[PDB]
Amino acid sequence: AGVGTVPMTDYGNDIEYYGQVTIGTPGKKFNLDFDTGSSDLWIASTLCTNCGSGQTKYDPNQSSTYQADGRTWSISYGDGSSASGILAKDNVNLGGLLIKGQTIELAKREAASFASGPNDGLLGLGFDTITTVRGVKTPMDNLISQGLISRPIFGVYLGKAKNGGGGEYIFGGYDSTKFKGSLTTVPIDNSRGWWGITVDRATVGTSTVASSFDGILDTGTTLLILPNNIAASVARAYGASDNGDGTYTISCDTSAFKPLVFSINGASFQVSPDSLVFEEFQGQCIAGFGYGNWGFAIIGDTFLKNNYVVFNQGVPEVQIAPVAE
């Protein structure tokens, strides 16, 4: 694997994607979820009292480069999960790039969904205006300032379980084998600390199911979550039925569905028919799109496993192109 190249592991039916990170000296490998919707780097530690027995835990005592920090932290994600603990400092090796002196957040407590998932913690890739502790420099901030990347970018390829899973993150570069055509440049709004974009319209066949709306590119959100009127409008196009819990029940037979097409900055990006079905349970299928009571959409893995994204922290802007498949 090339410099700053991190091969990802697809968990379940495109639930999430994690990669290995080496923390400490001599260091241990941690499977972290790469999240563009958050900016805190936290990991399960031996200070943890409700952590999974399966999780790999960071042990201060076994890293000769650990440095104590008197600050505490606590986070609350949008799916109701959380974690809390203490700050510390150590070295993080991301794809061969050794970030020296990264602020790592060691978990003392964590939600049970963390304890039972595949992750040892999270790597956040949002802007630093949203770190939970003021003054923390995120890993991207550090790669740039330590000169480990020459371009303030990361290229993201998320695979489809249907095709073998996988995925790959490249810090300071991108891979044109993973996409097709020309990249489209889309300006980013980071005023709320996220990768915000504007979708000009959404169509299904010849029907305009939605006009322009804002969304955030979130690699760490499984589905495409839309504001209530938009979701409703999309579901009507597919005969999906509201399960009343932010999810829809859709036909398992996607063969007749037309793709959901997003018009972003003049180009067409889609959610292929197959991605319209998230999961099949005892012959009932959950749709790849859901609803939330937000004015903005959460453009999650349903969309990202269909379109390659180059994230530029410097401008900021993104470059999108249809995945090559």
């Binding site: 999430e16 900016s39 609350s76 949008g78 969904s113 956040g124 979130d218 760490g220 959100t221």
Partner: peptide
Amino acid sequence: XVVXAX
């Protein structure tokens, strides 16, 4: 599902 710092 999972929905990461809202």
